[PDB]
Amino acid sequence: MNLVLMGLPGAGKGTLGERIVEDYGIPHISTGDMFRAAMKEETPLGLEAKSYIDKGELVPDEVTIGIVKERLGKDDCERGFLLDGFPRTVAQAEALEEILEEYGKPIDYVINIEVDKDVLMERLTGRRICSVCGTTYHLVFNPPKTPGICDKDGGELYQRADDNEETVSKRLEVNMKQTQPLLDFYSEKGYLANVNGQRDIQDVYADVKDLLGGLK
Numbered sequence: 001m002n003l004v005l006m007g008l009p010g011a012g013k014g015t016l017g018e019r020i021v022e023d024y025g026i027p028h029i030s031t032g033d034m035f036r037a038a039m040k041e042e043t044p045l046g047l048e049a050k051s052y053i054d055k056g057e058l059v060p061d062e063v064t065i066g067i068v069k070e071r072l073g074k075d076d077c078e079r080g081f082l083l084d085g086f087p088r089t090v091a092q093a094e095a096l097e098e099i100l101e102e103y104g105k106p107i108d109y110v111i112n113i114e115v116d117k118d119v120l121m122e123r124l125t126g127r128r129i130c131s132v133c134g135t136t137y138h139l140v141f142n143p144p145k146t147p148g149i150c151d152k153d154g155g156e157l158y159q160r161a162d163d164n165e166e167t168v169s170k171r172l173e174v175n176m177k178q179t180q181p182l183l184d185f186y187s188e189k190g191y192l193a194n195v196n197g198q199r200d201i202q203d204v205y206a207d208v209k210d211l212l213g214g215l216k
């Protein structure tokens with residue numbers, strides 16, 4: 001079960017992925033989280049990526065592909081993996097094809113989570129994330145039971161620094177222009193699957209899980 005999750009900023013990749021990893025036990029590999037986790041620890045990777053992330057721009061292909069190649073080679077990706085946010089460029093997609101061809105783990109499905117660009121600003125500005133587990137909430141669409149704290153562990157919630165109007169805009173802009181080429185690339189490959197991500201969270205998952213039977 002080798003999956004790739006794609007979608008414009010705020011389409012619901014993490015919300016979806018959380019789910020999938022709990023039900024199937026495949027590692028959730030988010031390049032965004034990895035970069036985040038690096039900026040937090042102030043690793044050399046974190047410092048270099050910060051420049052692009054804070055601006056809502058894409059981190060260079062070379063370094064990104066490099067960290068994804070190492071991750072996918074981990075013991076935990078034995079029965080599969082869930083890529084989240086990678087690739088988001090055709091060059092990364094082509095690079096990924098060789099890496100997997102090397103690991104002998106070709107992609108089963110690339111799941112595109114379709115959400116109209118004109119509602120993603122609302123999803124991102126109202127997003128609140130748990131500082132403890134990273135699970136996401138939304139003030140209007142899926143708020144915590146007790147405002148400001150995570151349902152699961154009681155940890156404080158925060159607002160990612162790039163979820164400000166100016167940076168969300170640039171993120172939508174940068175990713176929208178990479179979207180059609182990626183869809184084309186995988187549509188040609190034959191394993192692109194489109195899902196309507198503008199429904200209740202358990203409804204989008206329901207569709208997704210129905211593309212996951214038979215994948216080992």
Ligand SMILES: Nc1ncnc2c1ncn2[C@@H]1O[C@H](COP(=O)(O)OP(=O)(O)OP(=O)(O)OP(=O)(O)OP(=O)(O)OC[C@H]2O[C@@H](n3cnc4c(N)ncnc43)[C@H](O)[C@@H]2O)[C@@H](O)[C@H]1O
Binds near residue numbers: 007035127136201
């Ligand atoms: N491969 C790569 N190459 C180069 N650079 C890279 C890179 N990968 C990462 N980067 C860099 O890293 C940065 C950040 O990457 P990343 O963290 O991956 O940014 P992103 O792509 O913008 O995605 P998000 O995390 O913001 O959203 P998501 O789709 O997971 O949504 P969520 O589930 O939270 O949902 C959003 C909100 O909606 C709510 N929600 C979820 N589902 C629903 C639903 N069905 N209905 C209503 N609301 C919902 C949630 O509760 C939440 O509040 C980039 O700007 C870039 O610089």
Ligand SMILES: [Mg+2]
Binds near residue numbers: 013032
């Ligand atoms: Mg995410």
Ligand SMILES: [Zn+2]
Binds near residue numbers: 130131134151152154
């Ligand atoms: Zn939490």
